[PDB]
Design a protein around this ligand. Structure first.
Ligand code: HQM
Length: 372
């Protein structure tokens, strides 16, 4: 399922340099701030040779190439970020990008798995995974707080990895009827989820709201229900008609969904808009991680097991997990207020109110699953 013990859904030790064959791509991606500002970004993209993807032969080089092409694509479409957009992606980016995206089974737009899960390095390999020892590989504009937003997102993923590695213990304990082992597992998950909540606080240290809202959000925006590209984007030379794809959001994280699925909280049940969105966002996750979520829904229910045993210790450990999720969602809502709602007050579903209502629906659905 391509889940790492240490960093979870994050790509371990991402690749940083492509083969020299792709130098022309890497130069543009590494210089987005200068090229966007000077107005050379679009000219440089339009001057690119067509580069075959046949020199990208392992998962790490393909993932780096997707991140490179994805950042180039956002810079090309959105430009300087003030409404002068391009609705046609030139063939010499669109064709290799779409081919690579098909091989990796991801849509041809920058997604969370590119610009967070694969967009990072350790400064010192001998030091731990702390903010001070980490950097991103690509940013869009000087002052866009991309390092802070991407790395804090990644730090939440790494924190969650401590809980994700316990999930097999949970199902093995239910299968083997190991009550004490299951109780310890559920409590360990809840403890890790509250430590993940502590990581959330780091966003205030590294991301300021004006920069995030007015700059970074622009470059992460997509072309699904977006009035600036109402029919989607033309991937020139690959598909004739434009296609719509959503921009990035926290709902693309597998961490956002996997614990609800583990605990039997049915966030994708029904035809409601929140459910449909979370189902649709699975298409924006790496296929192995989609598969992991699907396997969790097919396993015997943790929730029915705990409810069937007349075990107040099991129910409370389960409830500790649920409350931890509820806290996480509530802090998530505070982030929406500080980083979106308030900056806005001075694309369909992108509106801060729609984002707010979505998280409130999710948090309510989580609260409903409390046993007592
Ligand atoms: C392409 C792309 C897509 C997404 C992202 N990373 C992002 O969105 N992180 C995020 C955003 C919001 C706010 C805007 C509203 C939302 O999108 O729901 C709240 C919380 C978070 N996390 C932890 C934070 C403390 C940084 C998320 C919360 C769920 C688990 C992962 C981290 C980066 C690039």
């Amino acid at each position: 399922y391509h889940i790492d013990e240490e960093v979870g859904f994050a790509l371990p030790n991402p690749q940083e340099n492509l083969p020299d064959f792709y130098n022309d791509w890497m130069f543009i991606a590494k210089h987005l701030p200068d090229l966007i500002e000077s107005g050379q970004l679009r000219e440089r993209v339009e001057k690119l040779n067509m580069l075959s993807i046949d020199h990208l032969t392992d998962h790490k080089s393909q993932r780096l190439a997707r991140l490179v092409l994805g950042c180039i694509t956002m810079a090309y479409v959105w430009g300087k970020g003030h409404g002068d957009v391009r609705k046609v992606l030139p063939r010499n980016i669109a064709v290799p990008y779409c081919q690579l995206s098909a091989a990796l089974e991801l849509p041809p737009i920058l997604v969370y798995a590119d610009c967070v899960l694969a967009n990072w390095k350790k400064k010192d390999p001998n030091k731990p995974l702390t903010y001070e020892n980490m950097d991103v590989l690509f940013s869009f504009r000087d002052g866009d707080c991309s390092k802070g937003f991407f790395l804090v997102s990644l730090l939440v993923e790494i924190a969650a990895a401590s809980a994700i590695k316990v999930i097999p213990t949970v199902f093995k304990a239910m299968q083997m009827q190991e009550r004490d082992t299951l109780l310890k597992a559920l409590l360990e998950i809840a403890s890790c989820l509250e430590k993940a909540l502590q990581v959330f606080h780091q966003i205030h240290d590294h991301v300021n709201p004006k920069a995030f809202f007015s700059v970074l959000r622009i470059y992460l925006s997509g072309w699904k229900g977006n009035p600036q590209l109402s029919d989607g984007l033309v991937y020139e030379g690959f598909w004739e008609d434009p296609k719509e794809f959503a921009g990035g959001s926290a709902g693309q994280s597998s961490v956002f969904q996997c614990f609800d699925v583990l605990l039997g909280i049915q966030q994708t049940a029904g035809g409601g808009h929140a459910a449909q969105f979370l189902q649709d966002m699975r298409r924006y996750m790496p296929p192995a991680h989609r598969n992991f979520l699907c396997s969790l829904e097919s396993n015997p229910s943790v929730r029915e097991f705990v409810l069937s045993k007349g075990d107040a210790g099991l129910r409370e450990a389960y409830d500790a997990c649920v409350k931890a999720l509820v806290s996480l969602r509530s802090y998530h809502l505070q982030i929406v207020t500080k980083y979106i709602l308030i900056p806005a007050s001075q694309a369909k579903g992108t509106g801060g109110t729609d984002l707010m209502n979505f998280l409130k629906t999710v948090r309510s659905t989580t609260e409903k699953s409390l046993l007592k």
